[model samples]
Target: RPYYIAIVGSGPSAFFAAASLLKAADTTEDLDMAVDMLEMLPTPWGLVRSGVAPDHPKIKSISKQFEKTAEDPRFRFFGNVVVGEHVQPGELSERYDAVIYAVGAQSDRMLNIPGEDLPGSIAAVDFVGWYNAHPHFEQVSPDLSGARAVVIGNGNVALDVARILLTDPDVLARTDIADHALESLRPRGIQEVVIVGRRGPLQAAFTTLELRELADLDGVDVVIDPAELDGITDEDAAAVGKVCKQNIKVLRGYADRERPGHRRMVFRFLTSPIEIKGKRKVERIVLGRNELVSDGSGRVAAKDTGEREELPAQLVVRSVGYRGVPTPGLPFDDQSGTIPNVGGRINGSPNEYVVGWIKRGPTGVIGTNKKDAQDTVDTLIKNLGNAKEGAECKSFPDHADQVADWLAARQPKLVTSAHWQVIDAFERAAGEPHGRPRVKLASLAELLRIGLG
Candidate 1:
């Protein structure tokens, strides 16, 4: 039997699923499958283009693999097509054999603290998108006029945000950073970036690679008070993983060094932001002192002490993590920010599935999604022989044509893979004189027009 699958969101997981499915069919002569990838943006590559740090060219090059997946003859890309709005999940199921939700965690988790919604306080997700030129976040004007800024997380994303703010603008100009973000940073008043983590150094989520890059950043000084390590006991080090151990070693190296660079990147551990306080925009933040205590598991967790400290700042970027929004006609787990699934199969929903962050909650790197997609595809293929009585979508022979006509009528500005290649080449050509990969087109209108060319 031939299978037509609809994959929502053209991200890493979506491409992985497409590749895995095609490979599976090749390995099994009886299996045949095709994929239709739907994306809300005019461009593809989802987070690889928008969520990755602009300076990390090595990591961003994964787009090559994604492009190959899109190039497959059996895979069709529909860009600028909103799935939930243009076609409902049930509607998609009616046309395809199965529907795969690869739409990653599109929003950030909230701090749920006082003054979180203030003007200068923003999510690191939004800030990353803004600098990377995500169309929905192009207008996110984070105030960089102040001398000091506070970043509330200890993950790689938090490090990326801090680095972008503190890195010399000239260095960033050579990269594919959004022109608007560069303009905002070139003449900025930001002189200090304080990265705040609730737990001790051993508990930090960041890797040593991101931490070590601070040393390579010219004109930026990395400062970590040795006093912060006072709480990290040998027992704590033993409990922490190798990455955290390496991270602590790197932090100590930073503290032992003398710094001449004017701008400072400070790391504050055992501290949690209690409230963001400002009359107009964020002027300062109140932070609570924390101590590590047994979390009832073998490990420990940060517990707040009554003591508090205040740090003056203009902008505060919260980077706790990402969470997915409820998709129309899909069962969602509010607590997990994931679609309720059993080994990739959506609970109580026949022939419906999920992968990537939306499947297992946001964790791991880009390569991590490969195993996840393979697992989902294996399960899907295993269940192919089951009776189709409960399946939601009734296979229609003209499903592709029907959906194509409906989408073409609904969105005349739809972008195809060919269109993306045009914009891709144009961006590279525009960046040729600048010695960068591509000077991203920051606006939806600009992307649409360029995509046409």
Candidate 2:
């Protein structure tokens, strides 16, 4: 092949890269020669299929573009595929002229503290994936009914976790929420979702869209004190005042409402989780109050005030941030929360490119990936001509089967997307009897039996 472009992920970034290439293809009559797509998943989308909050049906529908990419002749999707272990970077470079890693940031950042590993404590990423029925997560999340859940941090994802917990079951059921999560939240006894921010409300990291969405959930009351908004001083709040205004406006509007749900989202400010205490699961949270300091124009300044408080809760989701997985051949940055890539170019190598959260830190909504992917793809195209030709690139079946062997001991029944579709067909057929959506097998072992056989 004279010119080959291979994309490593099937998430929003990967789809966007392919979309960019297709647009380029349309502009030039011979553009087909310039672009090709190879996806790592049996299913498309790293997050859309898994990480996207299960309740966001409209956001998930963006997968239609991915379907378009599959229909294009130049695109090829290698589902159930993994890089580094099965397909090495050098091997991939040999087969294709340019390679793009859209692998995304798979793991979430942690609060490196005691009780973090407790049975009831989990990262927001893992928690979101569980309810969404991500293939890799096998453990059943604890029952959410009759519970008080606390989400740490103030990012958009933290809001999402809070919103999902506070929303009514009727709203959640029709969407793709897994059967287990649906069953767990069925009783609707969970009354409070406390969204904690180490900084003041003015310095919160959520967008107006997310805030507006959380504010409007029927049957879910939103509670936030304007006095808590006062925690952000004039100096510190100046930078984030716009953010604070939107949040306060939403909360104030809710407070004015005559009917608010018994289930409520409590927006707590200047609060840091000191320790989480529980019996079998989470029982209470020791909260250390925080203070916001103006660091400067470039940074979010915050100081810890000695004040401490506590609230009883059943489950805790820490939504601090996310970290990129170390591709076997890629250099990772623990401090920066990403793979070390310069301008989307792999630091040491000339050909490898990374996009989205793996290149940048885990931030931005889905649309943000489009620009990020384009930056990386631009670099890939620019470097494509110079890439050493005749390099031997790894191909699927060659690497995937070997990793499948390695995974045998741990997950012998792992089914790729194609096989997963077979299972889905079975579920769809079975769901008719229950008057619901597709029914998923609850256990990995049972799934494996169907997949392996």
Candidate 3:
């Protein structure tokens, strides 16, 4: 009998953890292990498949790394299986020596302003999902007929949404965007997009690459308000570190260039949305002018100036931040949107652990998960020897030779790694005729049919 483990969520963190476990087995003679990675959807690579913008082929190629990790004989993938619904946490702990929850943050923080629930106001997560062809958001019909759109936040997601809106329709058509979303967005009437951040340029939170790429979008002009850059003093530049400095350099370059195009992307800073105003749908958002003020801490925060102005927009996408949803049978922090894990071990819950955004809130890039996975693996390794800390350190009594048989008997629609590979090959084949990388299977029924075939 082998030491069994189950990891929830098939994202980068899960893959990294599985890879760490395999590597640990190679060098550590004590680690005779097998890992089962469970995923809710029929697909794997959680955010890599559904959240990342489709036009980013280079970035999306990281899925190949996950593919390699899944190839390990010690790793088993169970797709289309929701743990909380399909198998309760109590049963999961009993079945495996340890369970690692790698579920990433799935919900977005609300704007919490007037008319935020209006029809035209949406979270950037849903908008990104709609454009990226995420299965959950496939039915979402975002009205792209507006001439002006507003995106709140200065992060990479906000930029991605704004860029996708302003990019040439022909370019998006060539990507793996869902056929439905592509057809709807191909004839959009949007002429200008406004990206707003609550803080000034120095305090903005976007990567240099994301900001630089906005200038390269064909037929799109990146516009920056010169007045917003006026407030950046030497002290402010020194405080925010090098990223913002590079951001300002890129913005200044955009400001210096006068290349006019069919679509315009505007960057606004030091403004916060006070209220999303409309009768039934979003008409305009009331913004409060904000200024950087010392809060006694070394870092400066945005403080509203009481003065307000309204910006007209038919559509609004708020990319403020992401928060994790409370998982069934897990200790969660409502304030931080994270699980309460003491060094990756869920407080008071033996054999239960967490990793990735759900473990540490929504922070860091995809590569950041590698270190996080390694740290969690170290903790799991340390706890492995504790006899009284977890379930009986024993495998299922002469369990079915194949974990597939165990799960298949319980779940008729269970999708194995082999099934996912079949679906993967189907997608690649569907896109082979064209020059597109791959055409995504956005329907669970379609996926299950093809996978089970």
Candidate 4:
């Protein structure tokens, strides 16, 4: 029996789901035909390589598990297959036993403010995609030569955008940061990054680890007004208060002190960017000072009473949030911004599943996806229920290996893990030369041509 499963994306969620499914059938070859494998990008890992901030190599470590899952003889990965277009959902569902939509969130929730479509205005998701060198993006060459940029959002990704601009391009040069990104960043005059949030500090969403990292970067001076933390109500003030206390401590230590070789990062809360103002690029932004409007549930929304202030800026990036775009055949929830699923099981359907950010609206850290995938696998196995005797599972190593050979046959310069390791080695060797972190390969062409004739 060809117990086939077509996973939509090649990111962490898809990887973990594959891991969970394989672990279920690992000990028993007779345990009902196992998953044939996944459908991923020509180069696997959707957001791990692209959405994750380049400076945080620790965050990208989740890909190691996906690599392990890919080694399974039964698992297959089909790269260069675009789910909505190239690989239609109805076609896969009819043939395969299941179709898992892990096609992760690819677009950001917009602020819907005026001038948001200005030349210099781009979504932070797109910006992250560009800098990380997603193939679909071609190459990321953000214009940071302008002296200032405004990142609107209070989440961790917003913080990352701020830090990347402030962090030395030389430091970024060593990581897998895109060559075009590095080229654009190498000689830039971006001195300040203002990360804005619509809500108060209490309503903010960010990990303590991220905030601390921003505060402690080598050449970054952080400024946060302590008064903002005071406005948090007692009920919401518990965990938010603790994080804010630490955030304030981190920022206060560097308050008014300009460190050599560092850029300034300002964490501003209680203000919303009502309008992005500019003639050419982004010249300035009009901000609305906010107050907490509480509903019966005691939660707060940033409500402005028509008060405004104008601040000058050279560029702007909006980091409001991310949402799951509907695939051609998946049932989508217009309200929640996610695919419809019941405990990882595709709702009102059989054998279909979804996991990771696509299933959960792009929240949580990399490690959190562990639980997400397990939940889906549990559903999958339970649906399989009962055991049969002497029935041998069919031999289908999925399409991943086929994909490997196909790309290898076509390009001849494609890198396997072993080859990527060589590039990694070169990066490490170059790191010590500059008394800094890894110095990255300058371009995609160079990487593809590294060990080829």
Best by TM-score: 1
**What tens digits encode model 4's per-residue C-alpha lDDT throughout 1-453?**
435666777788888887877777765565543444434334567777778887888877777777777777666655445667654677666656667788888777888999888878888887887787665564435678887889999888898888778788767866767667777777757888888888866677876777777756666678666565564455545555687656545544544343455577887888898898887667899999988888667676778878999998878899888877877777898766788889898877776789988889878877788899998878876665521122322244544445445434544544444455566567657766755345555445555455332
What TM-score do all the candidates reach, one by one?
Answer: 0.96, 0.84, 0.95, 0.84
Candidate 2 TM-score to native: 0.84
Cand. 4 TM to true fold: 0.84
Candidate 1 wrong stretches, greater than 4 Å: 259-261, 388-395
Name the TM-score of candidate 1. 0.96
Output the better candidate (1/2) by lDDT. 1
Candidate 3 wrong stretches, greater than 4 Å: 258-261, 388-392, 400-406
RMSD values, in order shown? 1.8, 4.5, 1.9, 4.5
Candidate 3 is scored at a TM of 0.95
Report lDDT per candidate: 0.87, 0.70, 0.84, 0.71
lDDT of 1 by residue, 1-453 (tens): 468888999889988998998898878876778888889998888899998888998997888988887778888888998888877898887777888899999999999999999999999889999999999899997778899999998888999999999888998999999999999999857999999998878878898888898899888889988898886765656657778778877888998966553899999998999999999789999999988899899777889998988889999999999889999888999988999999899999778899999998988889999999999988887776463534633556766677778778777888888998888888888887998889888889999988976
lDDT order, best first, reads: 1, 3, 4, 2
Locate the minimum summed-lDDT window of 10 residues in model 1: 385-394
Q: Could you give candidate 2's per-residue lDDT for residues 1-453 as a string of tens digits?
A: 335666778888888887776676566543343333444433457787677776676787787777776677655555545677556777666655567888888888888766777777888888887787775665747667646888999998898788777777787776667787887777887888889988766667877777887756887777766577554445544455776666656655654654343777888877888888776667788888766666878766667787777788878899998778788877778787677888798888777788888887788888999988877777765565343343433233433334335434333334444565566577567665765555555455555556446
